[PDB]
Each structure stands twice: as structure tokens, then as C-alpha cells.
Design a binder for these strands. Structure first.
Ligand SMILES: [Mg+2]
Ligand SMILES: [Mg+2]
Ligand SMILES: [Mg+2]
Ligand SMILES: [Mg+2]
Ligand SMILES: [Mg+2]
Ligand SMILES: [Mg+2]
Ligand SMILES: [Mg+2]
Ligand SMILES: [Mg+2]
Ligand SMILES: [Mg+2]
Ligand SMILES: [Mg+2]
Ligand SMILES: [Mg+2]
Ligand SMILES: [Mg+2]
Ligand SMILES: [Mg+2]
Ligand SMILES: [Mg+2]
Ligand SMILES: [Mg+2]
Ligand SMILES: [Mg+2]
Ligand SMILES: [Mg+2]
Lengths: 208, 152, 83, 100, 99, 127
RNA sequence: ACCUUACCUGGCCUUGACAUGCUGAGAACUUUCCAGAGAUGGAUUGGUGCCUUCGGGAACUCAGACACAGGUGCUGCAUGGCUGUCGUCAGCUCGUGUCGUGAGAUGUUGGGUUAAGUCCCGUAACGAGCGCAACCCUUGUCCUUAGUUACCAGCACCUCGGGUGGGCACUCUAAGGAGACUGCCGGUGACAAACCGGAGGAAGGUGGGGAUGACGUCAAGUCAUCAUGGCCCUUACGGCCAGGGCUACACACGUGCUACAAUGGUCGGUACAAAGGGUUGCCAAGCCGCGAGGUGGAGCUAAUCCCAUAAAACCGAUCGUAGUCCGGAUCGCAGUCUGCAACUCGACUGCGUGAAGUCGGAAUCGCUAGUAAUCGUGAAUCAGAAUGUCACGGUGAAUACGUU
């Protein structure tokens, strides 16, 4: 059958919301619209950079954005001629002033979004999918990662019939609420259609 | 049920008379959760019984149920090609349930002004046995001798 | 129906095309599309061609249709019969 | 959810919002008991002057990302099948799955 | 005699904010009663999950709103008027009344 | 002096105060029968009091919130039981045998998706 | 109802309602008029703008030109994502070892036991993973902190309204904890797993309900929410506007509401809920209407004001089983309200008319305890429109010997 989204079911329990603020009956819809627009725009623009988590906070009539990226050099170039243009543009979109903090993340191969994006862009370049799956799983398991599963669905190769493959290693218990299962999905556009990539990563148990 | 772990709840909430069968008859006559309606209807019926009947109405009640309870009951079992019936002794607990259900369902079918005096009428009729509930009881009883052949 | 706070309701260009019309007697049907408009006793005898969906059906107004709207005298669904 | 249709409902939004005052004044004068039949009738004429594409009844609210005419939740601004997608990612603040 | 009303979505932030403001007020020389909790508003939504016809397949979501009340007896130091940026940080709304 | 008890049953909450007296019985400053109109509620309230032959030994002042008449009657019974045991702490075994101190945990079951009632379902034609 | 809208009739446009790239003219705005069902076309006082390398430039409106833009057009049997179903059933697999020429098999069979591939014991198998269980939410007991707008045990005042002063007793509200673990006793049991009892305890045997849906199956559903490989039209399968239809009607089927009455229908006063929504909003008091409503403007960003009077239930009076003091369909006349507009085609109100229906064939359905049955209340969508969906409480049963 179908499986509930592992991030959503764990909201509040072990995961955290990506937009933390408060609003009322009037400004709530506007704030959600601004958040969705800013997130899609930021992802589309800094596609080249490996951006994973866009955290939004809203103090009184202000806004703060923090970016989790594996490559901070591109955004922080020669002492700040990039993030400032971004601040100005976001203030053009967001009526309130903005605030940017580029957060660098270590171990990119332990982040589900980055692994999914790398696998998808590899499949876009006509690379065999099994090799990509094996390389991603091995890279993840060299460090930590008490379990990882990768699934790819579509017209693999160029066959005119779709199928699903997946490779797992370690343990990935999706029915345990303590476990913080990082999860990601992405789409790779090829000449023969769309290929869907899903990544589950198991870090460990949260006790007490 | 295959498991047979389903225990039974015990109900005993007689308001003034402090009896047992009375409350179960209350539940039998209660419809759609109208417990107070059942209270007043059955108590008016019992008042009519008490004014008509010289003695107390509870022993008249139990005597009436004594003449409606079927001793044996017939139950169809298919031998695998023919539709038979088999007479069996009724479970001792089941006798009171059949008595109450039959008496209520027969008091329901009189057609006079209300069912309080209907219940009184069949309570006095069943007190010796000139009613219709006793008619059905004796019919079901005689079906057993009509089918005594199988029995085992 | 429409509350007594508002007596009539007529398309304004229809009102101008009827009020100007009465300067001379009934000589030509007036083409109308707004089925919603009320009709008073002041266009009695005039023939109005009301739009029906594919044609303008002409109807001659009399004094005995003051309380009925323009569309009631024009049928939009045919139903010639099952057989 | 054709983009022309989104454009022609957004333009309806502007047309409704851009008057925003003549409707109120005219209808208040009409609903005022003591204003004389002349100010009833001229107000009716005035209401019938302006284009029909000005009322709030003509305005059908739509999803701000897809414009799906059905399945709307006005507490948010999203449709039926984007609210869930955004919620499972945690974008909507203070939204979880309920059991009680 | 001022009163402070706190709105939040999750109790984790509101409890921390109430503890911080109570400790600051008691440390600065004010007199403070006991933090009063109000009934939490629960907004219920039920939404179809299938993109096409499956009426019995629902998803139920809930929004919780937590309300807290505090009072200041003997207002002697308005230091809390220099600490809004710290008292409220990300998702707690603070109202002050009867200044 | 006096003693106190609280009885909860079927979303009905009742507070009972027990003092010396003979059993005047006040329901929100109202007569007992003026409150319980033609029902066994009076008898079910008097059950635990009369089980210990102390109907005339005490006076009772109670208040009730929430629920229906049967729920409030059960709440009164439970509350006066908890108040009485606070006075004569040797009859706990008797009430345990009578099963009066034990609260009724039954509560209305919520409605679920795809069902009319909490457990009723549509007819399901198979063709 | 218009819109929604994707269909029909008719009218009206061609780089276009929308994006980028070239050229020219200039502000948007406000222009209070005319023709036109309307898109549209023609007058229309007013201002010539912002910043200036003072040269110029950004934005906005219109005209032309191509590359284009556009499609709810087809293919779910080319796809992603999402969903149903077997089924919340207890199963589905892998590494190493061993057996067989091999497909394969053992593990995972067997004796018990459990809701469970749960557990114990044996045992060429030894271990592991996804499932089961547990961690999450809620409900039932108690404790700590908390006392306004919530509460009122004591004290006093009281105009007898926690109304007032006042208190931190209580209920309650919401955070953190304790508690239930076959824990103790008896018997059975291969002196194992476990079962059957007992005490205590608010709760006893996963306490009650929820969320949680393994490997896969049905080329299952969706190209019309979205995205996307192909194919297709470009004066049209692309756009705009008026009306009409989706609410049609010799019939058939599914899911519902109301009844066929006396455990009822009317009349009078009468007691007790939970949950929730409200500053483009709720809309009180008063006054005028039999009536749906209208004026009015209070209080409220709300445990503070409003929606808002629960109903079935209980007491007294009447009807007397009659197609009726049942039942309300249908219809005639006159009205209220939102809406530009209630004919097609809205919801309610007043008077009058008053049908079928006497408990329903073959056949067929739901339900095991706050369950069925029955009674009312609220929210979403929404200007208006619920017998539908989701949600909350009141009263409250019968039955289960048994597995052919
Ligand atoms: Mg599109
Ligand atoms: Mg609308
Ligand atoms: Mg509940
Ligand atoms: Mg119910
Ligand atoms: Mg059927
Ligand atoms: Mg398919
Ligand atoms: Mg598919
Ligand atoms: Mg071999
Ligand atoms: Mg095998
Ligand atoms: Mg097997
Ligand atoms: Mg297992
Ligand atoms: Mg589980
Ligand atoms: Mg026991
Ligand atoms: Mg198919
Ligand atoms: Mg149209
Ligand atoms: Mg239709
Ligand atoms: Mg009648």
C-alpha cells in the first residue's frame, strides 16, 4: 500500500517546522504565500549551490532566513557581494526587511536532499542507475548512517515500460517514532520522461 | 464467538420493588432508550393488575411467566439434503428471556387504548393461560412431540 | 420574489427603447436579450422579440402580463417528445 | 486552471476593488428608509450604470499556486492538493496530524 | 499594574518565554502572581488526499493555539520594556496592557 | 469540621460537602425532588448513604456541572461515597464489595471517517 | 441564477488576457458623455511627471515586427507524484553454512502458547532486515505549580445578582510527574512459555479509542490539481462578451430524509449538555411586525461581548384509533432576505387546499457496551443555498449454548 510521509508523521515529535512564527486571521495567508514563493525562488536560483534547508523566522515585522548548504564559498564570494543582492531582492518580495545567515553543513553525503539531487543529476547525464545507487549507498555508509535506502522509479535507461528499483542497507525502521528518518524526493528530467528518486536515511535513536 | 472470552454485565437497578426480573422486563419493554416511559407504562399496568388482582402483583407476574416459559424448543438442522427440525431442552437462563420476549410481543398486538392495559390483560391471561402467548408456547411445545423421532 | 423595497426592474436601454417607442404606435417589434426585465402596462400592445438561446421569439404584450417577466413567454428547452 | 482564466479572475479582483465605495454609498442610500423614491430610483440607475464585473459575488477565490476552483481553505491560501504537500514538509507553521 | 498576554503555537516556546519573563520580573524587584494558562484553541481540518475520487480517504490536521496570562504587582522597574527582542524570539506573541 | 468529596461521571462533575445533620439534601440550593423530576435519581443517590444506615446522620450540600440527569445522579453517588469514606475509614471494604467508589470509565465514542455513527456503516450493495 | 464553465447559439479580436527580446509616441491617474445585449469605438476640465552625468535614465500606457505566447486537445497501455484494494491480515525476505546434477530446499518444519513468524523447548543450521510489539495523541485516578476573564468553602456587606470586599478551600483550565508492569497469593502446566482464579487498586491482563498500512497484486484510478516524453491546432482545438444547459423526462438502479401513529399528535409552565465560530466580523438592549424580518447601536481581537432559548426527558389538560386533532407531498394567493439580476433556476414566511402511506415479495444490510436505537448542537465550502461531509454531547438496551 501507501506510506505516510515520514517527515510529517514525526512533526513535533523529533522534527521541526521549517517556518516558525505566529500570525492571525489576516496576515497568515500572506505569510504562507511569501514563504512558499521565497522558498521556490531561492531553490531555483541557488540550484547550482547545494542548498538543503531554508529556515524562516519572523520576529515583529521582520524576517530572518538561514540557509543550510554544503558549499558556502559560492554564496559568500570575496567578502560579500552576493548575499546583499539576495537581501535586496528578498526585501523586494517580502514587504518586511530580511536577514540572511549562511550555515555550512558538514558531511553532505549524510543529507537526503543532497544525495537525491546528486543521483537525479547523474541520471540526467545518461549514467547507469545501479552504479549511482551503489556509489551513494557506499559513500553514505563509510561514515555513520546506521541505515540508508534509495529508490528510483520510471523508464530506467530508455525502455518503454516503467519500473521501480530500490537498494537498502543497514536498518531503516519507519514504524518507530523515536528514529529521526531524514527523507527526500527529487525528479530528474530526461529525454524519455521523468525519473523519481527517493532517499531515506536513518541517523539513530532519540532517547529521553 | 470462537474466542469465548466475552463476559456478561450484571444489571440490577430496581427503583422501589427491589427485585431482579422486573428490571429485565423493563429493558425488554424499553424502546429506543425511553426508560422513564417504560417506568410509567409498566407501573400503570402493574397498578391495574393490583387493583384487579387481590394479591400482590409480583407473584402474579412470576406465575404468569411460569405459564409462558417453554420447556423444550425446536430448532432446524439440515441433514445434508433434507430440512429437519430437532427438539432440545431449553437453557435454564434462556427460559426467562423467551418468556419476557413472548409476553411483550404478544401484549403489543392487542389493539386497545394503550399497551399498559394490554400488558395487564396478558399478565392476567398468562396467570393461568387463556392468552395468545400461552397459545404460542403450547404450539412450540407440541412441535417437540411432533418431532420427537430425531431428538437423540 | 423581489422585495417591495424595489418595485420594477428593467434593463435601462430597454426602458429608453420603449419610452422612445411610444411616441408612435406599434410599428415594429423591439429586439431584446435581457429576459430578467419586468414589464409594466406602458408597453402594452408592443411586440418584443426576446432572445431564447438561438432565436428571438416575438411576443405581443397585453395588459394581462404586468406581473410576469420577459422570459416566461419564451421556452428554451424543446422536448418535442420521446416518441 | 488555464493562465488566461487566472488572469481574467485577477483582473476581476482589481475591477471589484477599484470602486469599493460607490457600491457601499448607493446601497446604503437605497436601504435607508428615509431617502425618498427619487433617491431610490436614481441609486438603482447608478448601480445599473457600472459594469457587472464589479461585485463580490462574481469573485470566485482560487488557489494562489494552481488556481483550482474547487477544494479551497480560506484559513490558508492553498488548494486541497497543495496544502497537504506543503504541510508534510513542515512549511505550514503549527500544523500536525491529529488523533484525539 | 500591567498584564501580559502570550500567544503561541507550541507550548515548548511559550513555557520558556513565561519562565524567562517571570524570572526577570522577580529578579528586578517586581511582584508577580502565578502564570495563568487559558484553554487552547484547536482548529480541525479534514482534507481529501487522492487527486481523484476516493471519498473515504481523508487526512486530519490540527492547529493548536496556547494562551498565557501574567500580571505585575507593584510596578517598580520597566526593564521588560527593553527586552521584547529577547522575551519574544521566533513564534511567541506578547501583548502588554494597562501600562 | 465537615468533609468533602468529588464525583465525576459522564462528563458530569459534582462537589459534595458533608456536615452533621439529618439529610436535608440541597441540589444547587434547590429541593431534591424539585431537581430530580419523576426518576430513580433520588434512589440511586440514596443507595450508598442507606447502605451504611447513615441517612439521618448527616446533611449534604452539593453542586453539579455538565452532563445529563443520569450522569449528574451518578456523579452525586460517587462524590458522596468518596466523602463518606473520608469520615469512617473502615467501610472502604464494604463499598468495594458494593462497587460504588469505582468510577464508571465509559464515555462517548468519537465519530470516524467513512461511518455515519461511531460504528454504523452504509448499506454496501455488492452489485 | 450571472461568474464558476471546460458545452450550445450569436456577436467580437489576431505576436493576443499573460512572459522575454526591437522601434516610436507619450504617465499612471482622473476625465462624470454618446452608440452598442457587451466585448468595443468615438468626446472628456485637469498633470506633464521621479531621479538627474542635466546630456540622459528607470517605471507605466498605446501602435507596429518576428522569434513566440497559448490548449481543461489525445495517449494513466510511454511517465513522476498522489490514492484505492487484498488488509492492519501476519506475513515477506537476505548473508554465511549445509543438502541436491539442477530448478530449488533448510532456516521459516515440530510440541505447546499468544491478538501476533509473540514467547518457551527442541532442532544443520547460525544470524540479520522489513513487518508484530514499544516510543506519539486522547480518555479514566492522584500529586506539584498556577488563580484572571475561571471558582466560591469560610468571613462580612448585600439592592440578595460571587453582586460586592475577600480567599487560594474546591470545581475548572494547562504544564510537569506518580500509577498497571502477570506486579503478590492458589492451582494447573514438560517443575518452561502460558492459562484459570483471588486480594489490593480508579483502572488487570496489549484498560477504552485513534494515528501508524511490510514484500507485492489488480498495465487498478488520475494527462482535468500539478509536472512531464511524444503527437496535434496556430484567423484557432487560441482569446472576449451577452443569453441558454449542466437542476430536461415514457423508465431502471444506489445512497438518504419523512411518515404510515396512542411507548403517540397538540396546549401551559417547566431541569440538565458538550464542541466551535466571530474586527472586509458577531451583531445584543429597546421599538415596530402573528410571522420570516426591519431600525437601532451596545459589548467584544474574546474562559470577559455575541452566535444561543438545546432536545428527547418530567407534570397537568385534550384528542380515542379514525386515512383521524396522523401524515405532509402537491397546488393557489400574499410576503421576508442576499444578490446587478430569484422565469429558465434560490432559501425561508403567512393563509388556505390537502395526496400516497394501515409497517412493506423474492431478496438484502448495519451493529457485541456509552455499541445498537433515538434526541438535539456546531464547523468547513459560502453574498445566498445541506435530508450531504466532518465533528460534539443527552437518554440508553437485547443477544452470544456453539464452529456442522
Ligand atoms: Mg497549464
Ligand atoms: Mg460565489
Ligand atoms: Mg470525545
Ligand atoms: Mg451519539
Ligand atoms: Mg442491495
Ligand atoms: Mg496504472
Ligand atoms: Mg501512476
Ligand atoms: Mg552442491
Ligand atoms: Mg522456503
Ligand atoms: Mg513462509
Ligand atoms: Mg518478530
Ligand atoms: Mg504498532
Ligand atoms: Mg482481578
Ligand atoms: Mg487501465
Ligand atoms: Mg457566460
Ligand atoms: Mg450536474
Ligand atoms: Mg398534524
Amino acid at each position: 500500500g501507501q506510506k505516510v510521509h515520514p517527515n510529517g508523521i514525526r512533526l513535533g515529535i523529533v522534527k521541526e517546522h521549517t517556518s516558525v512564527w505566529y500570525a492571525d486571521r489576516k496576515n497568515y495567508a500572506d505569510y504562507l504565500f511569501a514563504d512558499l514563493k521565497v522558498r521556490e525562488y531561492l531553490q531555483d536560483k541557488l540550484k547550482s549551490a547545494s542548498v538543503s534547508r531554508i529556515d524562516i523566522h519572523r520576529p515583529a515585522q521582520t524576517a530572518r532566513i538561514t540557509i543550510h548548504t554544503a558549499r558556502p564559498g559560492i554564496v559568500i564570494g570575496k567578502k560579500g557581494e552576493d548575499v546583499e543582492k539576495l537581501r535586496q531582492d528578498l526585501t523586494k518580495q517580502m514587504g518586511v526587511p530580511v536577514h540572511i545567515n549562511i550555515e555550512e553543513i558538514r558531511k553532505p553525503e549524510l543529507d537526503a536532499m543532497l544525495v537525491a539531487q546528486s543521483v537525479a543529476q547523474q541520471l540526467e547525464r545518461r549514467v547507469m542507475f545501479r552504479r549511482a545507487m551503489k556509489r551513494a549507498v557506499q559513500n553514505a555508509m563509510r561514515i555513520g548512517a546506521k541505515g540508508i535506502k534509495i529508490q528510483v522509479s520510471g523508464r530506467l535507461g530508455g525502455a518503454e515500460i516503467a519500473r521501480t528499483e530500490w537498494y537498502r542497507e543497514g536498518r531503516v525502521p519507519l514504524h518507530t517514532l523515536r528514529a529521526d528518518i531524514d527523507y527526500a524526493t527529487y525528479e530528474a528530467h530526461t529525454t524519455y520522461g521523468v525519473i523519481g528518486v527517493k532517499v531515506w536515511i536513518f541517523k539513530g535513536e532519540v532517547i529521553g | 464467538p470462537r474466542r469465548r472470552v466475552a463476559a456478561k454485565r450484571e444489571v440490577l437497578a430496581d427503583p422501589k420493588y427491589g427485585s431482579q426480573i422486573l428490571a429485565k422486563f423493563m429493558n425488554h419493554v424499553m424502546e429506543s432508550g425511553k426508560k422513564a416511559v417504560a417506568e410509567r407504562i409498566v407501573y400503570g399496568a402493574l397498578d391495574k393488575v393490583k387493583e384487579r388482582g387481590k394479591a400482590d402483583p409480583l407473584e402474579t407476574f412470576e406465575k404468569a411467566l411460569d405459564a409462558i416459559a417453554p420447556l423444550v424448543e425446536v430448532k432446524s438442522r439440515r441433514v445434508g439434503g433434507a430440512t429437519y427440525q430437532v427438539p432440545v431442552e431449553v437453557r435454564p437462563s434462556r427460559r426467562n428471556a423467551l418468556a419476557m420476549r413472548w409476553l411483550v410481543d404478544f401484549a403489543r398486538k392487542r389493539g386497545e387504548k394503550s399497551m399498559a392495559l394490554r400488558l395487564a390483560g396478558e399478565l392476567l391471561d398468562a396467570a393461568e393461560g387463556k392468552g395468545a402467548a400461552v397459545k404460542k408456547r403450547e404450539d412450540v411445545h407440541r412441535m417437540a412431540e411432533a418431532n420427537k423421532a430425531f431428538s437423540h | 420574489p423581489r422585495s417591495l423595497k424595489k418595485g420594477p426592474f428593467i434593463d435601462l436601454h430597454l426602458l429608453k427603447k420603449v419610452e422612445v417607442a411610444v411616441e408612435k404606435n406599434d410599428r415594429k417589434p423591439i429586439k431584446t436579450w435581457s429576459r430578467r426585465s419586468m414589464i409594466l402596462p406602458h408597453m402594452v400592445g408592443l411586440t418584443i422579440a426576446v432572445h431564447n438561446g438561438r432565436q428571438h421569439v416575438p411576443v405581443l404584450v397585453n395588459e394581462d402580463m404586468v406581473g410576469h417577466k420577459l422570459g416566461e413567454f419564451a421556452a428554451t428547452r424543446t422536448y418535442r417528445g420521446h416518441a | 486552471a488555464k493562465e488566461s482564466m487566472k488572469n481574467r479572475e485577477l483582473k476581476r479582483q482589481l475591477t471589484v476593488a477599484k470602486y469599493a465605495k460607490k457600491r457601499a454609498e448607493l446601497k446604503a442610500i437605497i436601504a435607508n428608509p428615509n431617502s425618498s423614491a427619487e433617491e431610490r430610483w436614481n441609486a438603482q440607475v447608478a448601480l445599473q450604470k457600472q459594469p457587472r464585473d464589479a461585485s463580490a459575488s462574481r469573485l470566485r477565490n482560487r488557489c494562489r499556486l494552481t488556481g483550482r476552483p474547487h477544494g479551497f481553505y480560506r484559513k490558508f491560501g492553498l488548494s486541497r492538493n497543495k496544502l497537504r504537500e506543503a504541510a508534510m514538509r513542515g512549511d505550514v507553521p503549527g500544523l500536525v496530524k491529529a488523533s484525539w | 499594574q500591567i498584564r501580559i498576554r502570550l500567544k503561541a503555537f507550541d507550548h515548548r516556546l511559550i513555557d520558556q518565554s513565561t519562565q524567562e519573563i517571570v524570572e526577570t520580573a522577580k529578579r528586578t524587584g517586581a511582584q508577580v502572581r502565578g502564570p495563568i494558562p487559558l484553554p487552547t484553541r484547536k482548529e480541525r481540518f479534514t482534507v481529501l488526499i487522492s487527486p481523484h475520487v476516493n471519498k473515504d480517504a481523508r487526512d486530519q490536521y490540527e492547529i493548536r493555539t496556547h494562551k498565557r496570562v501574567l500580571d505585575i504587582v507593584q510596578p517598580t522597574d520597566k526593564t521588560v520594556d527593553a527586552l521584547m527582542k529577547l522575551d519574544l524570539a521566533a513564534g511567541v506573541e506578547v501583548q502588554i496592557s494597562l501600562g | 469540621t465537615q468533609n468533602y468529596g468529588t464525583g465525576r461521571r459522564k462528563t458530569a462533575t459534582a462537589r459534595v460537602f458533608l456536615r452533621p445533620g439529618t439529610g436535608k439534601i440541597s441540589i444547587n440550593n434547590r429541593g431534591l425532588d424539585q431537581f430530580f423530576g419523576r426518576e430513580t435519581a433520588r434512589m440511586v443517590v440514596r443507595q450508598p448513604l442507606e447502605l451504611t444506615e447513615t441517612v439521618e446522620k448527616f446533611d449534604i450540600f452539593v453542586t453539579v456541572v455538565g452532563g445529563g440527569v443520569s450522569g449528574q445522579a451518578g456523579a452525586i453517588r460517587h462524590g458522596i461515597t468518596r466523602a463518606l469514606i473520608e469520615y469512617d475509614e473502615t467501610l472502604r471494604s464494604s463499598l468495594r464489595k458494593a462497587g460504588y467508589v469505582t468510577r464508571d470509565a465509559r464515555e462517548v465514542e468519537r465519530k470516524k471517517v467513512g461511518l455515519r455513527k461511531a460504528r454504523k456503516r452504509p448499506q454496501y450493495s455488492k452489485r
